[PDB]
């Protein structure tokens, strides 16, 4: 997270940390949507690691220092969107299934809890303030991820300002949403991918976007791009299979 503040996992209990066997390596963030399912970004799985190489940790404030109430899980399998475009990042969404001995995997605690999925017809006013989280880099030129979870607060940009012309001619589809700091500017950064962009909707933090991509981290007037989740509700459902 570029800008922002250091946070406690209890303020974002749906944040998952995904590791890949190297010896472990921090891969991306994730979002707990159900007891055994977590959402993430399709671009995180380009290297095509077998499920048994992935570990999902829940309830951890520090990236590599074990929390007292954390829950580690093996990955049963994962589903990357069939139409994910490796060049434009369109359809950047994946589903990961947790391994367990029953139909229940993660258990609720003060440090582990699900975000609410958005209503299919969710529409927020321009500039709504939302927040995000992740263990990613603090700056684009940084060679290290964060030692501790961080949070940032951004505002949803108008669709009119979420275009190729605005993103230096980088391709922007209807499956994407822009959000940024309207003013150390806050922004997502490398390593935060797959994490959540959530907004308060009727007293509950609701998932609005999956941290996808951006140009650098925190450049004035250049918003971050996120996978537009409302467009994937039917896909989430059809794909949540045992």
């Amino acid at each position: 997270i570029k800008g922002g503040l250091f946070a406690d996992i209890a303020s974002h209990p749906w944040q998952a940390a995904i590791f890949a066997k190297h010896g472990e390596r921090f891969l991306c963030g994730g979002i707990l949507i159900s007891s055994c399912w977590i959402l993430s970004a399709a671009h995180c799985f380009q290297e095509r690691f077998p499920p048994h190489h992935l570990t999902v940790i829940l309830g951890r404030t520090y990236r590599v220092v074990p929390g007292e109430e954390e829950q580690k899980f093996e990955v049963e399998k994962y589903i990357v969107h069939k139409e994910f475009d490796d060049d434009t990042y369109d359809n950047d969404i994946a589903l990961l299934q947790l391994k367990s001995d029953s139909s229940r995997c993660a258990q609720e605690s003060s440090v582990v809890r699900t975000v609410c999925l958005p209503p299919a017809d969710l529409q927020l006013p321009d500039w709504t303030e939302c927040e995000l989280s992740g263990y990613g880099k603090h700056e684009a030129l940084s060679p290290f991820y964060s030692e501790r979870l961080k949070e940032a607060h951004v505002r949803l940009y108008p669709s009119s300002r979420c275009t190729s012309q605005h993103l230096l001619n980088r391709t922007v589809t209807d499956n994407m949403l822009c959000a940024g700091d309207t003013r150390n500017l806050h922004d997502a950064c490398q390593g935060d991918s797959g994490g959540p962009l959530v907004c308060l909707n009727d007293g509950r933090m609701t998932l609005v976007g999956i941290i996808s991509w951006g140009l650098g981290c925190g450049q004035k007037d250049v918003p971050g791009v996120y996978t537009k989740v409302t467009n994937y509700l039917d896909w989430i459902r059809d794909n949540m299979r045992p």
């Binding site: 303020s11 809890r113 609410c116 959530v198 007293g203 509950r204 933090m205």
Partner: peptide, 7 residues
């Protein structure tokens, strides 16, 4: 339930 956090 969902979306609740340590406030």
């Amino acid at each position: 339930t969902c979306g609740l956090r340590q406030y």
